């Protein structure tokens, strides 16, 4: 395994990085602005809970389609188990747990709804991390969001937080 790309500057052990705090204190590995192995600036793709499902669903279908080259939450869970039989054999149980998990906590189950969610958050210039926190975080009020996310507390107005939040609430009803 690699996951390197960024060339080193000090091979000798120095300080061992900075503390991995949720306050945007992400490491070089989790650098918000970085370049992938295509030579393309791949900014940290801080994937959200519900859109992760969209990615996973697509991936489950992908693997299945690649192989072919060679609704209620419960109904979705039933479908997941079918896809697990189609794509794995008890391997990567991490994924098995994750998709059932994300389904259980889904708030934006459909792509169209998610697209709107993404649009609202990125339009305000939130860090990928901050976007991920809000895209995944269910929330009743800006006071909850600010308390749970201090970087909003010290940067974003409540008017905008509530505006988007209640629009997101509507988008949650629009799963």
């Amino acid at each position: 395994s690699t996951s390197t790309f960024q060339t080193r500057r000090r091979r000798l052990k120095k300080v061992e990085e900075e503390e991995n705090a949720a306050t945007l204190q992400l490491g070089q590995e989790f650098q918000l602005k970085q370049i992938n192995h295509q030579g393309e600036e791949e900014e940290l793709i801080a994937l959200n809970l519900s859109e992760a499902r969209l990615v996973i669903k697509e991936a489950l279908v992908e693997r299945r389609r690649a192989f072919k080259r060679s609704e209620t939450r419960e109904k979705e869970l039933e479908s997941i188990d079918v896809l697990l039989e189609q794509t794995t054999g008890g391997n990567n149980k991490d994924l098995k747990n994750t998709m059932q998990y994300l389904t259980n906590f889904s708030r934006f189950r459909d792509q169209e709804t998610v697209g709107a969610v993404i649009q609202l958050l990125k339009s305000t210039g939130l860090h990928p991390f901050e976007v991920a926190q809000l895209g995944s975080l269910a929330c009743d009020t800006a006071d909850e969001a600010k308390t749970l996310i201090p970087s909003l507390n010290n940067k974003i107005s409540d008017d905008e937080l509530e505006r988007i939040l209640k629009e997101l609430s509507n988008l949650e009803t629009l799963y």
């Binding site: 690699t2 996951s3 390197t4 192995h37 393309e40 791949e42 994937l47 992760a52």
Partner: peptide, 11 residues
């Protein structure tokens, strides 16, 4: 929470 990245594997 989850992070997508183009990785590499020396086989």
């Amino acid at each position: 929470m989850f992070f997508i990245k183009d990785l590499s594997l020396n086989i």
